[PDB]
Amino acid sequence: NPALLKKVDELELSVRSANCLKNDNIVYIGDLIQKTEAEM
DNA sequence: AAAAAAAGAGTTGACACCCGGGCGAATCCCTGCTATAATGGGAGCTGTCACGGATGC
């Protein structure tokens, strides 16, 4: 799917979500969608 | 099963500034006054008709 090319901070869900995503060092949505509940 | 904080709000002083209103100064517009003698004017058709009307005796 072409949606994976978009960055993780391209949806602006919330401030805490952006903070934890930046702390996790994620650039693509695939690494976040793969981890369902373990890494979350 | 409990219990406090980055944001989210809410302000509180602390500059940075940006046209406005005066203070100047430098400079525009008006108006009148000049003392020998000045003394009637320059284009323009004029190589279309024909009609339809307005004056005159």
Coordinates of all heavy atoms in Angstrom, one line a residue, chain A residues 15-16 19, chain B residues 6-8:
Chain A
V15 N -0.7 15.5 20.9 CA 0.6 16.0 21.3 C 1.4 14.8 21.9 O 2.6 14.6 21.6 CB 0.5 17.2 22.2 CG1 0.0 18.4 21.4 CG2 -0.4 16.9 23.4
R16 N 0.7 14.1 22.8 CA 1.4 13.0 23.5 C 1.8 11.9 22.5 O 2.9 11.3 22.6 CB 0.6 12.4 24.6 CG 1.3 11.4 25.5 CD 0.5 11.1 26.8 NE 0.2 12.3 27.5 CZ 1.1 12.9 28.4 NH1 2.3 12.4 28.6 NH2 0.7 14.0 29.0
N19 N 4.8 13.0 20.7 CA 5.9 13.0 21.6 C 6.5 11.5 21.8 O 7.7 11.3 21.6 CB 5.5 13.5 23.0 CG 5.2 15.0 23.0 OD1 5.9 15.8 22.4 ND2 4.1 15.3 23.7
Chain B
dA6 P 5.6 18.0 34.1 OP1 6.9 17.5 34.4 OP2 5.2 19.4 34.5 O5' 5.5 18.0 32.5 C5' 6.0 16.9 31.7 C4' 5.4 16.9 30.3 O4' 4.0 16.4 30.4 C3' 5.3 18.2 29.6 O3' 5.4 18.1 28.2 C2' 4.0 18.8 30.1 C1' 3.1 17.5 30.1 N9 2.1 17.5 31.2 C8 2.3 17.9 32.5 N7 1.3 17.8 33.2 C5 0.3 17.3 32.4 C6 -1.1 17.0 32.6 N6 -1.7 17.1 33.7 N1 -1.7 16.5 31.5 C2 -1.1 16.4 30.3 N3 0.2 16.7 30.0 C4 0.8 17.1 31.1
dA7 P 4.9 19.2 27.2 OP1 5.5 19.0 25.9 OP2 5.2 20.5 27.9 O5' 3.4 19.0 27.1 C5' 2.6 20.0 26.4 C4' 1.1 19.5 26.3 O4' 0.7 19.1 27.6 C3' 0.2 20.6 25.8 O3' -0.9 19.9 25.1 C2' -0.3 21.2 27.1 C1' -0.3 20.0 28.1 N9 -0.1 20.4 29.4 C8 1.1 20.7 30.0 N7 1.1 21.0 31.3 C5 -0.3 20.9 31.6 C6 -1.0 21.1 32.8 N6 -0.4 21.4 33.9 N1 -2.3 20.9 32.7 C2 -2.9 20.6 31.6 N3 -2.3 20.4 30.4 C4 -1.0 20.5 30.5
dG8 P -1.9 20.8 24.2 OP1 -2.6 19.8 23.3 OP2 -1.0 21.8 23.5 O5' -2.9 21.6 25.1 C5' -3.8 20.8 25.9 C4' -4.8 21.7 26.6 O4' -4.4 22.0 27.9 C3' -5.0 23.1 25.9 O3' -6.3 23.5 26.0 C2' -4.1 24.0 26.8 C1' -4.3 23.4 28.2 N9 -3.3 23.6 29.1 C8 -1.9 23.6 28.9 N7 -1.2 23.9 30.0 C5 -2.2 24.1 31.0 C6 -2.0 24.5 32.3 O6 -0.9 24.7 32.9 N1 -3.2 24.7 33.0 C2 -4.5 24.6 32.4 N2 -5.5 24.8 33.1 N3 -4.6 24.2 31.1 C4 -3.4 24.0 30.5

